[PDB]
Design a protein around this ligand. Structure first.
Ligand code: CLA
Ligand code: CLA
Ligand code: CLA
Ligand code: CLA
Ligand code: CLA
Ligand code: CLA
Ligand code: CLA
Ligand SMILES: CCCCCCCCCCCCCCCC(=O)OC[C@H](COP(=O)(O)OC[C@@H](O)CO)OC(=O)CCCCCCCCCCCCCCC
Ligand SMILES: CC1=C(/C=C/C(C)=C/C=C/C(C)=C/C=C/C=C(C)/C=C/C=C(C)/C=C/C2=C(C)CCCC2(C)C)C(C)(C)CCC1
Ligand SMILES: CC1=C(/C=C/C(C)=C/C=C/C(C)=C/C=C/C=C(C)/C=C/C=C(C)/C=C/C2=C(C)CCCC2(C)C)C(C)(C)CCC1
Ligand SMILES: CC1=C(C/C=C(\C)CCC[C@H](C)CCC[C@H](C)CCCC(C)C)C(=O)c2ccccc2C1=O
Ligand code: SF4
Ligand code: SF4
Lengths: 80, 130, 74, 148, 61, 739, 160
């Protein structure tokens, strides 16, 4: 399964979570930004690696980073 | 006509699940609709909702979530996605805590959070042979 | 002659590829730096833009004018 | 002709060096990917975001520079072989006159000397060069499958 | 630094590193990156603004 | 306040000319990177994203059609002007079989005057392979003054179409209901446009082209031929050549149409004097076509209680296997411009290819069959246009599926049922493509390896294992027996290609029976295989344009997007555009093989010279039958052999063909930089170049960015097509002009 | 002489080339009639060929064994009109172009909408800058001295 990391440059704009096609990211409470929220990656087993999450990231060099790793039938997007 | 009365009025497509969603895992999405709206299947073509309970089975979590995202355009929000293992091993997936992941809910802990920016990552040469 | 020249090109490309691999996975900036100042190898990454820009200029110069003279003769 | 082909060789060397040096120096990161070292030497891309990041890894620089190495070695070997074919046949005036323009190369090296090779087997017979014509066609086929 | 001040970006992983931007607002709360800087050059993603820390910006004289 | 048009919808102003990108909501803010410049031209004609109203899109399309027709009229006016002023048309008229048509002279600069060839008739210029001279002769044009007046009329018509476009966008723009009158539009395009154009052309042929060309074939010089208007004012100048005009129009109105058999014939074959189709046959053909199309125009109900409703016709065509059938197709084709473009472009390209075939098969112009460069150029050009238009039709079908397809409006109809079993279609098409490719190409490779191994009796040849195209030979036999048996009123077969005598004009073969052997079997199956693979790519693009097992929401990404990401193992080129890109490549492959087959087969087994005793000697000498069955044969006896004229053209009047040969090779190789590489490398190289510019304080304000992934693919495919087609263009033209 | 070459005025193969080209042109001329424009054009071709060959002969041009003018670009002023003088001319023109482009970029870079003035050129300012490039060698060695030609550390750099 791929690896997804969140960095404290998160501004809690939720654009990553609402762009994930496989429900990998979610918004959790935080105290490091104005919005009081930070993205989390608790379901990386469903991560497919499409990187839509970091295409919607407005922070300078990203706050969500996807590191491709071992492959799985879920991560390979295999309907068969 | 169909196995269950709650199935959407779909005529069947050769784009549904395969032998994989009989021995590895299958995904089911359930929702209740006020109207028998006509919607597009994530796999094939057009299906008709039931004015009530609707249940659909798919081979991938992404297919169920694409269907759910389409449902939001019909003002449908109560859709819920489950994972079924080879036997009846049902696990609720998408509304994991009953609140959509885009809305902050208490009781969630940060997973995969690093307390630094990208520039603070360690040099790969110091991560050799571990 | 053809065999040895092809082997030569392969070996040169391999040398540069393994230099890139060394940069990715073996290079340590701390070892090549003493009190802020950088050694002879670490300084190659400071004027890297200068090196690449001048390689690009030489390549464009030679390509433009060699092709120009060849097409003029054509 | 030697002058022009040597300048072509210099261009090939400089461009291959440019690709390889750019890949080596930009291996640890760039503006499009300031954390490229965290993804390793060989990775597919960084996604369609930030305008598109096709062939952004250092391995892709090697991959692109292989074409330029093949082209440069092809130029070098074409020059050597044509010069020596004219020297051995005695018509060194053919190279000295026709090597200054591209059509000279195409007509007097490739098109001219390819006649014995393609007639390694014809609808009338074959020669001991038949295996070389078969290898010629085989190389063309593998080249185009690479194009695929 | 304050609103309208000109600062130099010291963050290395930045499309505006070593460049100068205009501070839009410096947050007074306990956020990690309070300084908001607006730039004239859009980055590769199209954005022209970003939040920076207090130690990642250097005011221009 | 008309019910069909809106008056003064858009003000005629230059203000928006000074605001580039005003049409787009995203581009209107102004450029920030160099990507804006490329996006400006990529969205210029995408009227769907510029307005949210179908009416505005329709009006823009209508005015764009007017602009295109004005451009076409200007091009035709230029052609006629060049024929009038910079051509040897008058000299070619007096010696069609010995003077090469030329209509473009080259200025004497930088030594380029060598391009002015010895085309004959005391003229120097570039030989013309567009066949305008033969067309003008078939029109009865015997003077360059008539060409000048046709050019003036073309200029006037081009201005008229420009004014019409301006008028119908800015002064009186039609409403949506006017555009959606598909019944009225079909009625008019079938009766008025097609039928009345055929009728008017039949009238022109009968009254101008029939007498003038008959006099020309009789040997009368163009100077003593009467002016065309005299054939109308004087019923005696035409009644001598065709002694049936003496009865006037009385036989027509008295149903005694047999009297007009003098100039309305049904002969078949070719004119022995000119080698083209009998112009009496052509006039009769156009008359019959006019009547048929006028009749066909009275089919759809427009404004009276009479005719058909296309909605009622489609909705009644259901079936047990097709569910709702064609229900909803009328709404699809009356609310989506992209669906109409798909159908029209596909059928238009197919029509162009059919035209290309019927052109050389039955030469319709005088002295055009013996002008081999003209025949080769016309066939190749029309086949190329057909292939491009077919790929465009597939592209716009995919665009309709992505954008204008409504799932609710197409419940259980044909479109829905096709998407529901797209897997089966694509898998079986994949199997067919593999079967056809394996067989055709592997038979070629088996022939090649048997020849290379010295086993000549193991080939798939005529003197070996033989694959006779018996079905095509049966059809050829049926056509050569048609006159008198199935077409009892025919005097000769439709084309001598099916069989018959060798038709020669001035010792040059015009048409001759095209024998089909094992060599034609293999190349025909190669054609079928390439066409099937192109169809596979395009149909996979159209069917999987909305969703798939990989990306269940591919329709939300649009028609044109590079990927969905490196995940799922890699999701490159999943668009539908990336399928029109690969399909463009495969169309290039298929059309290149088709034109190669045509060129070699014609040069080897049709074209040539006929000795006075009747011995036929061809351009190459019949090497197609035995040497076109191996890839080495194609490489040597066709490519290497017929490329001799291109490479040896330097210093001659064909040197431009060698230069274009080399330049097209250069462009084709240039394409591979964009096709093989990726955006990240070029962006990071532009980073260092920008560093140098900033170091010298010369960095542009518009930030330079590498071409987008989709634009990189588009540039690569455009350069690839241009280079390959130009290389084949120069090769064909130099070879067929030299010999 | 230089590199074993000989002057084209004494190169027999050069005159053979001239004679062959003239003979081909005259043979082409034979197949046309009287003072017709084709004959006039071919005669002009012959005259231009003769003039070009005569000018190349009397041009301090060195010809090889193929009878074609070879360029001596080692740097000697004797053959200075072959490379050195055209080199100076191009350097002047290209420096002019680069200088006016850089001046326009830096001038509209200090306005409210720098990017707008790059797709829609300020033709008055463009004309003002373009005709001022004749002093580009002097302007360049008056801006480099003042430090206004080179940036120092505001230039951006990648992560490593
Ligand atoms: C003595 C020289 C030498 C040595 C010791 C190495 C050693 C190494 N290289 Mg390296 N390399 C070399 C030369 C060398 N290379 C040269 C000359 C080039 C330029 C072409 C490269 C380019 C290169 C790249 C780009 C990469 C490496 C990598 C590696 C590492 C892993 C190798 C691997 O996984 O192999 C895998 C082996 C294969 C995949 C087999 C490939 C076989 C090829 C396709 C030829 C087989 C076809 C054959 C000709 C059939 C004929 C066809 C017939 C019809 C005629 C390893 C440390 C990789 C790495 O991760 O390094 C850390 C990496 O990414 N090298
Ligand atoms: C015939 C094909 C062809 C041509 C002409 C080029 C030309 C070029 N490539 Mg290239 N390339 C090709 C095929 C080709 N490539 C292929 C197949 C690949 C494999 C993917 C690559 C991979 C590649 C890489 C990876 C790099 C280049 C680079 C370059 C540039 C080198 C500098 C130069 O010569 O400037 C002179 C330019 C020309 C002679 C050609 C354009 C001039 C035209 C004729 C002007 C016409 C104006 C009207 C140049 C634009 C390098 C670069 O960008 O350097 C700055 C570089 O980094 N190319
Ligand atoms: C749309 C099709 C078309 C095309 C491709 C051409 C192409 C050409 N025309 Mg032409 N022409 C056209 C339409 C066209 N024309 C029309 C409609 C008319 C009638 C007004 C003319 C009237 C015309 C004349 C009177 C002449 C040409 C000439 C030429 C040639 C040189 C053009 C040139 O250098 O202009 C350069 C133009 C510019 C720099 C303006 C910008 C060139 C082959 C010339 C020629 O062949 O000389 C021997 C010439 O004398 N044309
Ligand atoms: C008998 C009547 C008639 C005729 C001859 C045409 C002819 C044409 N129509 Mg048309 N049309 C008609 C009735 C007619 N239409 C009606 C009733 C409607 C309403 C449903 C439309 C709606 C319509 C649309 C929406 C479009 C056309 C288009 C076209 C052109 C197709 C391009 C082509 O084949 O090039 C052949 C070109 C020629 C033969 C050149 C000569 C044609 C000239 C211009 C005569 C045109 C006749 C015109 C209707 C007379 C009106 C004059 C005005 C003062 C009232 C062609 C000129 C398309 C086009 O290209 O737009 C411009 C297009 O997009 N038509
Ligand atoms: C009747 C014909 C017709 C019409 C009306 C359209 C109309 C349209 N097409 Mg389309 N298309 C056609 C034929 C047609 N096409 C054909 C035949 C093909 C197959 C190649 C395609 C393939 C195609 C694709 C793949 C796409 C479109 C798109 C579009 C839309 C936007 C077009 C645009 O802005 O381009 C503006 C015009 C340009 C950018 C011009 C580009 C210059 C070309 C590529 C090079 C031409 C070179 C020329 C031959 C000269 C070379 C000589 C050399 C020596 C210089 C528009 C609705 C796009 C879209 O989004 O649709 C919604 C899209 O993605 N089309
Ligand atoms: C010469 C180069 C080449 C070759 C051989 C092919 C071959 C093929 N392409 Mg293509 N392609 C090419 C270049 C080429 N392409 C390029 C440059 C592009 C870029 C645009 C594409 C893009 C492209 C697309 C987009 C598609 C194809 C498809 C296909 C397949 C069609 C089905 C078929 O005939 O399979 C049969 C295989 C052959 C004819 C190859 C030769 C096989 C021999 C003759 C017979 C068997 C030999 C035997 C098994 C050897 C065993 C011994 C060995 C083990 C030692 C086929 C594999 C389509 C596909 O997937 O297939 C349906 C498809 O959709 N191609
Ligand atoms: C006109 C301003 C201008 C100036 C002063 C420079 C200056 C420079 N460029 Mg450059 N460049 C320019 C425009 C300019 N460029 C444009 C428009 C492009 C896009 C094609 C490039 C693309 C480019 C590349 C790819 C590279 C350079 C490089 C360089 C450097 C070495 C010189 C060289 O290789 O020339 C390169 C020149 C060209 C490739 C041709 C430029 C095209 C035209 C001639 C310039 C535009 C004229 C402009 C429209 C005038 C308008 C002004 C008017 C309104 C007043 C040098 C700093 C090289 C470098 O970094 O080396 C250190 C390098 O690799 N440039
Ligand atoms: C060719 C077969 C054919 O066209 O028969 C025609 C057959 C009859 O279908 P229907 O009777 O339902 O069509 C009635 C209306 O839809 C008219 O189109 O169509 C199919 O079943 C499609 C299956 C294609 C299978 C490909 C083999
Ligand atoms: C003339 C003459 C002479 C001299 C000679 C010489 C002096 C030579 C030199 C030469 C040289 C001097 C050469 C060199 C070359 C170089 C090279 C070829 C290099 C390459 C490089 C590379 C490949 C790199 C890699 C890398 C990287 C990339 C980074 C990391 C690390 C490494 C290192 C790995 C004499 C007197 C003897 C005598 C005769 C005359
Ligand atoms: C070449 C060309 C051109 C020209 C064209 C033309 C010249 C055309 C003409 C056309 C025409 C000139 C046409 C005409 C037409 C006519 C018609 C179409 C008529 C019809 C009629 C009818 C249909 C009638 C019928 C009837 C009636 C109704 C009543 C009585 C009886 C009857 C039956 C007789 C232009 C310059 C443009 C451009 C370029 C190309
Ligand atoms: C070179 C290259 C670039 C860089 C190319 C750029 C920036 C294009 C630059 C075009 C210049 C600025 C304008 C065109 C200049 C030409 C001389 C004009 C065309 C010639 C006319 C006759 C038409 C990419 O962005 C790219 C993206 C994806 C895959 C491959 C590639 C790729 O190979
Ligand atoms: S890849 Fe990016 S987008 Fe796709 S799932 Fe993992 S995180 Fe969400
Ligand atoms: S960039 Fe190229 S590779 Fe990376 S995802 Fe987009 S398409 Fe696939």
């Amino acid at each position: 399964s791929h690896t997804v990391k969140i960095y404290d440059t998160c501004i809690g704009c939720t654009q990553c979570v609402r762009a994930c096609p496989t429900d990998v990211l979610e918004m959790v409470p935080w105290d490091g930004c104005k919005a009081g929220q930070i993205a989390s990656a608790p379901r990386t087993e469903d991560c497919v690696g499409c990187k839509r999450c970091e295409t919607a990231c407005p922070t300078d060099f990203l706050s969500v980073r996807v590191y491709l790793g071992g492959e799985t039938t879920r991560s390979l997007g295999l309907a068969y | 006509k169909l196995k269950q009365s709650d199935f959407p009025k779909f005529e069947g497509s050769t784009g549904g699940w395969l032998s994989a969603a009989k021995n590895e895992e299958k995904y089911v999405i359930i929702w209740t609709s006020k109207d028998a709206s006509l919607f597009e299947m994530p796999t094939g073509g057009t299906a008709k909702m039931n004015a009530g309970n609707n249940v659909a089975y798919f081979a991938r979590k992404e297919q169920c979530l694409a269907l759910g995202s389409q449902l939001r355009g019909f003002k449908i929000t109560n859709y819920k996605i489950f994972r079924i293992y080879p036997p009846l091993d049902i696990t609720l997936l998408h509304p994991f805590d009953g609140v959509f992941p885009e809305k902050v809910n208490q009781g969630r802990s940060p997973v995969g959070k690093r307390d630094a920016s990208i520039g603070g990552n360690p040099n790969p040469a110091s991560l050799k042979f571990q | 002659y053809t065999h040895h020249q092809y082997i030569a090109g392969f070996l040169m490309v391999g040398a540069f590829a393994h230099g890139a691999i060394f940069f990715v996975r073996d290079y340590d900036p701390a070892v090549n730096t003493r009190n802020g100042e950088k050694n002879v190898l670490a300084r190659m990454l400071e004027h890297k833009e200068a090196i690449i820009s001048h390689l690009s200029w030489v390549s464009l110069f030679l390509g433009f004018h060699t092709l120009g003279i060849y097409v003029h003769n054509d | 002709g030697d002058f022009l082909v040597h300048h072509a060789i210099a261009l090939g060397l400089h461009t291959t060096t440019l690709i390889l040096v750019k890949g080596a120096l930009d291996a640890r990161g760039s503006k499009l990917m300031p954390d490229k070292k965290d993804f390793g030497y060989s990775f597919p891309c960084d996604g369609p975001g930030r305008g598109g990041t096709c062939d952004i890894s250092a391995w892709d620089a090697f991959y692109l520079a292989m074409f330029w190495m093949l082209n440069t070695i092809g130029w070098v070997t074409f020059y050597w072989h044509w010069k020596h074919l004219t020297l051995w046949q005695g018509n060194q005036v053919q190279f000295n006159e026709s090597s200054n323009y591209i059509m000279g190369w195409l007509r007097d090296y490739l098109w001219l000397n390819s006649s014995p090779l393609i007639n390694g087997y014809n609808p009338f017979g074959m020669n001991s060069l038949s295996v070389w014509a078969w290898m010629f066609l085989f190389g063309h086929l593998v080249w185009a499958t690479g194009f695929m | 630094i304050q609103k309208g001040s000109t600062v130099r970006i010291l963050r290395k992983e930045s499309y505006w590193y070593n460049e100068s931007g205009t501070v839009v607002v410096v947050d007074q709360s306990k956020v990690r990156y309070p300084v908001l800087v607006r730039f004239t050059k859009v980055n590769y993603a199209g954005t022209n603004t970003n939040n920076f820390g207090l130690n990642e910006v250097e005011e221009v004289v | 306040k008309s019910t069909i048009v809106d008056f003064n919808p858009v003000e005629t102003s230059f203000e928006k000319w000074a605001k580039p990108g005003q049409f787009s909501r995203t581009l209107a803010k102004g450029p920030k990177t160099t990507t804006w410049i490329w996006n400006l031209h990529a969205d210029a004609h995408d009227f769907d994203i510029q307005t949210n109203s179908l009416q505005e899109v329709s009006r823009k399309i209508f005015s764009a059609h007017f602009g295109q027709l004005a451009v076409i009229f200007l091009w035709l006016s230029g052609m006629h002007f060049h024929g009038a002023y910079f051509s040897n048309y008058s000299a070619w008229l007096t010696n069609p079989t010995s003077t090469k048509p030329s209509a473009q002279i080259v200025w004497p600069i930088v030594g380029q005057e060598v391009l002015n060839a010895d085309v004959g008739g005391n003229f120097q210029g570039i030989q013309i392979t567009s066949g305008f001279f033969q067309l003008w002769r078939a029109e009865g044009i015997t003077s360059e003054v008539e060409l000048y007046w046709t050019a003036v009329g073309g200029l006037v018509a081009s201005f008229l179409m420009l004014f019409a476009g301006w008028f119908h966008y800015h002064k009186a723009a039609p409403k949506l209901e006017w555009f959606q009158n598909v019944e009225s539009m079909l009625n008019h395009h079938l009766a008025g446009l097609l039928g009345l154009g055929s009728l008017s052309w039949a009238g022109h042929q009968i009254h101008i082209a029939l007498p003038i060309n008959k006099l020309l074939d009789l040997g009368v010089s163009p100077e003593e031929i009467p002016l065309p208007y005299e054939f109308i004012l004087n019923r005696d100048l035409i009644a001598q050549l065709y002694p049936s005009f003496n009865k006037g129009l009385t036989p027509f109105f008295t149903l005694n149409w047999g009297e007009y058999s003098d100039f309305l014939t049904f002969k078949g074959g070719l004119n022995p004097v000119t080698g083209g189709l009998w112009l009496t046959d052509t006039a009769h053909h156009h008359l019959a076509i006019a009547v048929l199309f006028i009749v066909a125009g009275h089919m759809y109900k427009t404004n009276w209680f009479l005719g058909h409703s296309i909605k009622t016709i489609l909705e009644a065509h259901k079936g047990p296997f097709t569910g709702e059938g064609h229900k909803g197709l009328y709404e699809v084709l009356t609310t989506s411009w992209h669906a109409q473009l798909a159908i029209n472009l596909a059928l238009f390209g197919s029509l162009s290819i059919i035209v290309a075939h019927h052109m050389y098969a039955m030469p319709p112009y005088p002295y055009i069959a013996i002008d081999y460069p003209t025949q080769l150029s016309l066939f190749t050009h029309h086949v190329w246009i057909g292939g491009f238009c077919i790929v465009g039709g597939a592209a716009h079908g995919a665009i309709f599926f992505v954008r204008d397809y409504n799932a609710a409006n197409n419940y259980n109809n044909l479109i829905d049922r096709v998407i529901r079993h797209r897997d089966a279609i694509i898998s079986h098409l994949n199997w067919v493509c593999i079967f056809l490719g394996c067989h055709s190409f592997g038979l070629y490779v088996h022939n090649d390896t048997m020849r290379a191994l010295g086993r000549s009796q193991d080939l798939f040849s005529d003197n070996a294992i033989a694959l006779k195209p018996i079905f095509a030979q049966f059809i050829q036999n049926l056509h050569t027996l048609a006159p008198g048996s199935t077409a009892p009123n025919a005097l000769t077969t439709v084309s001598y290609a099916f069989g018959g005598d060798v038709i020669s004009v001035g010792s040059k073969i015009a048409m001759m029976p095209i024998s089909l052997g094992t060599a034609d079997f293999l190349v025909h199956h190669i054609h079928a295989f390439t066409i099937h693979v192109t169809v596979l790519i395009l149909l996979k693009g159209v069917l999987y344009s909305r969703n798939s097992r990989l990306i269940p929401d591919k329709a939300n990404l649009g028609f044109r997007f590079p990927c969905d990401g490196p995940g799922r193992g890699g999701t490159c080129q999943v668009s539908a555009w990336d399928h029109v890109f690969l399909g463009l490549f495969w169309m290039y492959n298929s059309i290149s093989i088709v034109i190669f087959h045509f060129s070699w087969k014609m040069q080897s087994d049709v074209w040539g010279t006929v000795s006075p005793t009747g011995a036929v000697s061809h351009i190459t000498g019949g090497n197609f039958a035995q040497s076109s069955i191996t890839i080495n044969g194609w490489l040597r006896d066709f490519l290497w052999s017929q490329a001799a004229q291109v490479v040896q053209s330097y210093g001659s009047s064909l040197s431009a063909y060698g230069l274009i040969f080399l330049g097209a090779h250069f462009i084709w190789a240039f394409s591979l930089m964009f096709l093989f590489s990726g955006r990240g490398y070029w962006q990071e190289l532009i980073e260092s170049i920008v560093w140098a510019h900033n170091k010298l304080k010369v960095a542009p304000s518009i930030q330079p960015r590498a071409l987008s992934i989709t634009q990189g693919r588009a540039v690569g495919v455009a350069h690839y097509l241009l280079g390959g087609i130009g290389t084949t263009w120069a090769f064909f033209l130099a070879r067929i002009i030299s010999v | 002489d230089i590199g074993g070459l000989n002057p084209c005025k004494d190169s027999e193969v050069f005159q053979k080339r001239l004679a062959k080209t003239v003979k081909k042109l005259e043979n082409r001329l034979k197949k046309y009639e009287e003072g017709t424009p084709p004959q006039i054009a071919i005669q002009q071709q012959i005259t231009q060929t003769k003039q070009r060959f005569t000018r190349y002969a009397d041009s301090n041009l060195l010809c090889g064994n193929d009878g074609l003018p070879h360029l001596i670009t080692d740097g000697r002023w004797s053959h200075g009109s072959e490379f050195l003088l055209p080199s100076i001319l191009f350097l002047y023109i290209s420096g002019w172009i680069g200088w006016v482009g850089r001046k326009y970029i830096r001038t509209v870079g200090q306005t409210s909408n720098p990017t707008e003035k790059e797709i829609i050129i300020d033709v008055p300012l463009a004309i003002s800058i373009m005709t001022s490039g004749f002093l580009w060698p002097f302007a360049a060695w008056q801006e480099f001295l003042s430090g206004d030609l080179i940036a120092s550390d505001e230039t951006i750099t990648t992560s490593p």
